[PDB]
Symmetry: C3
Subunit: 114 residues, 3 copies
């Protein structure tokens, strides 16, 4: 906060995603349903791109589901992770990488804005 996406890092040079961590310690239970986790990272995105927030596989396998999120090109708010404990109680420590941002080309169309 406020940190831009240029501050994120890749696990490795060939990693498709930029890792996202929560800035808070959060405990999630299945009955809580979707929770929006703060990242302290803000849009916007590089020109002609949009973002997809996806889970990391190791986190998904530990029972924390990240719902795929679309980040619009010109979003300037805080990127949050939408997360749910699937079956069990899940504990997110401050700073642990819990999702990833993928950048994709934004295709232009003639669809109207409405």
């Amino acid at each position: 906060q406020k940190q831009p996406i240029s501050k994120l890092t890749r696990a490795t040079p060939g990693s498709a995603g930029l890792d996202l961590c929560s800035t808070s310690h959060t405990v999630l239970t299945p009955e809580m349903g979707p929770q929006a986790l703060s990242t302290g990272i803000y849009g916007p995105l590089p020109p002609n791109t949009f973002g997809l927030i996806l889970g990391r596989s190791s986190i998904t396998m530990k029972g924390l589901q990240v719902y795929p999120g679309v980040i619009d090109n010109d979003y300037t708010g805080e990127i949050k992770i939408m997360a749910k404990a699937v079956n069990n109680i899940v504990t997110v420590s401050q700073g642990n990488r819990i999702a990833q941002l993928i950048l994709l080309p934004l295709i232009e169309t003639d669809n109207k804005v409405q």
Copy 2:
């Protein structure tokens, strides 16, 4: 019905997704599991693109999960939204925007058709 994807609209000029609404009022409960919601919008998609159906974040946070769906380039059927109430009873009013279509480049490969 039958309406083509060119009829969809963007929330804003920089919105990555084209919004999809259900043409029916639908109530979903968790025990129902995945339901396919009618949109009255039909493929196919622009040349060299395919589609991804994703949830809208505000709808996801209200407890309606949209399962990511792939729309093939030459699909000419009705685009449906695969949806589930996560934890609670969810009510979809006719016309409310419940998902979004994202267009992505379709990469060509030499993989066989089988």
Copy 3:
């Protein structure tokens, strides 16, 4: 095993995804939560691409959720499908197509590797 992604096939010429089958018969129950299903298919991916593993819609509607998975460009391990039975007991027969691989352009950025 070890089979490369070039061995996968498309349902049809205009299908966005390359189908993935499990090499094992697997039974899944909701209380099991996420399971990683073996495919016997291995990265890496074509240059300048990364992969997304998504469910097939017919499988999603039958109550088997595939969590979207990111496949890094230079991953050389086995591509596994992360799957959960949503509400009911689901049975995956050996060889049935249970997910699909989508290839997408890998955008280069100046983000650091850390």
